């Protein structure tokens, strides 16, 4: 299978994905994150975190009072499964995670933590 994918966070506050599909030959996935654009990290940051759909909203809160030198994460969250660093226009950054930390028949979402972005920008990860 494909063990990765390609996500674009651009200046209209949109992922290029709604929905993300992980094959289970995949024993790791990776996310290549870019960010198309020119607004800057500060007031258009993007991050790409995982996390149940159960601990979603908790994790963006926690982020969202974190601050822009945490990268809006909250440090050491047990909720987050996997993360990639908040970046700006023109920046580029990579995850690699662990798919046994996924199984089937539960809901994942994926979503930016930068204060307000998760309204749209958020989609589903799930394992098939
Ligand atoms: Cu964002």
Same mark, same amino acid.
């Given at each position: 299978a494909e063990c990765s994918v390609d996500i674009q966070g651009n200046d209209q506050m949109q992922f290029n994905t709604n929905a993300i599909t992980v094959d289970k030959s995949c024993k790791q996935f990776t996310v290549n994150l870019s960010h198309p654009g020119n607004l800057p990290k500060n007031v258009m940051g993007?991050?790409? !975190? /995982?996390? =149940?759909?159960?601990? &979603?909203? *908790? !994790?963006? =809160?926690? *982020? &969202?009072?974190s601050g822009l030198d945490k990268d809006?994460? +909250?440090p050491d969250d047990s909720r987050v499964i996997a993360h990639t660093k908040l970046i700006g226009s023109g920046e580029k950054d990579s995850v690699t995670f662990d798919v046994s +930390? /996924? @199984?089937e028949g539960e809901q994942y979402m994926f979503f930016c933590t930068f204060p307000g972005h998760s309204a749209? &920008? @958020? *989609?589903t990860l799930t394992l098939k």
């Open positions: 993007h991050n790409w !975190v /995982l996390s =149940t759909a159960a601990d &979603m909203q *908790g !994790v963006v =809160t926690d *982020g &969202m009072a809006y994460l +909250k +930390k /996924l @199984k749209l &920008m @958020k *989609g």
